[PDB]
């Protein structure tokens, strides 16, 4: 039976995509509801091709930070999601947001976590000369920081520039939020005292690897 979640996006939405052919290929996850604070956000055409109902909530229409955030996390608890899972949402929430989703709020980020928060990661691992780089998956607490759920990551070399990179990345982006969302959906994963469990045994701080 599957789980039920909410996707929160500001635009292009890969993340969102690699989700619905997945659950099209059997994983567990019913995507109740696609949220976006941009109305030109191109995820918002993936998820109605996908006949999922589909929110624009436009972050500056709202006097503050907190009616925005108020105006989502009501939007978002309609749905009684068990999961809240980030697919490219560039806004950052607030101390209160957070904790209302504490244990149940996720992001994924294109590198090996704590090194590379922020944009433009590729071309940054590659200046500093890294021979290594990949993607994270997260709890969310800090800009794009958190307990980690699973690393996956691979190797740097010669011939590599930051769009070969952002590709190949891509591709470990497709196949790990997936599998996360697997973990949860067979319920497999717990959050507890800064630590993620994972079949009630205690991961790794980097979280689980691949390879
Ligand atoms: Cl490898």
Known sequence: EPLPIVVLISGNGTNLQAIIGAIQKGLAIEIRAVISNRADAYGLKRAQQADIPTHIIPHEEFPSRTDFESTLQKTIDHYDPK??????????????????????????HPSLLPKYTGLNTHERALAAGETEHGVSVHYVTDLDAGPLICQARLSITPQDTPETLKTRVHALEHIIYPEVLSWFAAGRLNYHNNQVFLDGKPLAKSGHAFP
Do not use: Q
């Open 83 to 108: 999961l809240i899972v980030l697919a490219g949402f560039m806004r950052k929430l607030g101390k209160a947001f957070v904790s209302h989703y504490s244990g149940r709020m996720i992001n994924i």
